[PDB]
Amino acid sequence: LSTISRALTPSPVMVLENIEPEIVYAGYDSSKPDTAENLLSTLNRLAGKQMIQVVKWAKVLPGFKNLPLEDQITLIQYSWMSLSSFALSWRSYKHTNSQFLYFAPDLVFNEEKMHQSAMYELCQGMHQISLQFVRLQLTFEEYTIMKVLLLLSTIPKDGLKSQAAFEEMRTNYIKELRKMVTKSGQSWQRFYQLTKLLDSMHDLVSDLLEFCFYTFRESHALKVEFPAMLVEIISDQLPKVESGNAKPLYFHR
């Protein structure tokens, strides 16, 4: 054990900041008409590019790499939607002050786009999270920890290969959050507000997935395109979810 090495080691929070992926661009073609077909296909394309960066992020995520390859794949598949809309809400909060849905720098949604996307209510749900970020003045530190917790929010009804190791890393990250919001009195209130917001993601993600699975099934009739990345994810996720094999983890309720 090195006295120096231990003192110079980055806190998990600092590591989260270092590994956070750079903002990804959607490659949105502004010359094409803003119809549901084009906007949804474009969002799905963006989703793909983002998931590729998410996997690289999870690969170097403290504690995550120590999980069986099998569990890592499962966790990612189960949570990809949760991480997507949560990151969406964050960028919207930071770069727009929650005035718009900042899917990407080249793709910012206003009320109009929301209507044209044919998923207006789902957009309102995600936007409502951003509004909360404003009311709470959420910090980037709290954000990164919470995003990690979401990665570990849905598991197999029966469990992962290394259930013990998983509950460990999870509990450690929860503790990391407690420490953040403490930097008590208003600390306990803060922590509960954040865990309560994390739980609320499940009903939101449930509705987002329902529409995702629907548009996936009717992809041809709707003319909605999906990148191989998402085809790969949804193909395997959809049946597990509809089979009741996905188990949501809550803090309350």
Ligand X SMILES: C[C@]12CC[C@H]3[C@@H](CCC4=CC(=O)CC[C@@]43C)[C@@H]1CC[C@@H]2C(=O)CO
Residues placed in the known binding site for progesterone: 44, 50, 91, 215
Interface with ligand X includes 77 (CB under 6 A)?
no
Q: How far is CA 208 from CA 71, 126, 167, 236, in A?
A: 23, 9, 26, 17
Contact 230, 44 (CB under 8 A): yes
Question: Which residues are annotated binding-site positions?
Answer: 44, 50, 91, 215
The tokens for 148 are 């990690």
The amino acid present at 204, given as its one-letter code, is L
**Residues 6 or more apart in contact with residue 54 via CB below 8 angstroms:** 21, 76, 80, 83
Which of 181, 186, 180, 155 is CA-nearest to residue 170? Answer: 155
Minimum CB separation from ligand X for residue 192, in Å?
A: 26
Chosen residue from 12, 16, 28, 43 binding ligand X by CB under 6 A:
43
Interface with ligand X includes 215 (CB under 6 A)?
yes
The amino acid present at 22, given as its one-letter code, is E
Of 16 and 129, which CB lies nearer to ligand X in the complex structure?
129
Interface with ligand X includes 151 (CB under 6 A)?
no
Interface with ligand X includes 211 (CB under 6 A)?
yes
Q: How far is CA 166 from CA 5, 81, 147, 160, 233, in A?
A: 27, 20, 16, 8, 21
Instruction: Locate all alpha helices (DSSP H) within the chain, ordered by sequence.
Output: 3-8, 12-19, 36-59, 69-96, 111-116, 120-136, 140-151, 163-182, 187-217, 219-222, 228-242
Minimum CB separation from ligand X for residue 175, in Å?
A: 29
First to last CA, the chain: 44
**Per-residue x/- mask for ligand X, residues 98 to 117, rule CB under 6 A?**
-----x--------------
Chosen residue from 28, 38, 47, 114 binding ligand X by CB under 6 A:
47
Element at 247 (helix H, strand E):
strand 246-248
Of 94 and 178, which CB lies nearer to ligand X in the complex structure?
94
Chosen residue from 61, 149, 201, 224 binding ligand X by CB under 6 A:
224
Which of 143, 153, 133 is CA-nearest to residue 201? Answer: 153
Of 131 and 174, which CB lies nearer to ligand X in the complex structure?
131
Which of 150, 241, 240, 140 is CA-nearest to residue 202? Answer: 150
Interface with ligand X includes 78 (CB under 6 A)?
no
Of 46 and 61, which CB lies nearer to ligand X in the complex structure?
46
Chosen residue from 61, 75, 88, 233 binding ligand X by CB under 6 A:
88
Region from 2-10, 133-141, 146-154, 204-212 binding ligand X, contact rule CB under 6 A: 204-212
Interface with ligand X includes 119 (CB under 6 A)?
yes
Q: How many residues bind ligand X (CB under 6 A)?
A: 17
Region from 14-22, 132-140, 164-172, 209-217 binding ligand X, contact rule CB under 6 A: 209-217
Binding footprint of ligand X on the chain (CB under 6 A): 40, 43-44, 46-47, 50, 84-85, 88, 103, 119, 122, 208, 211-212, 215, 224
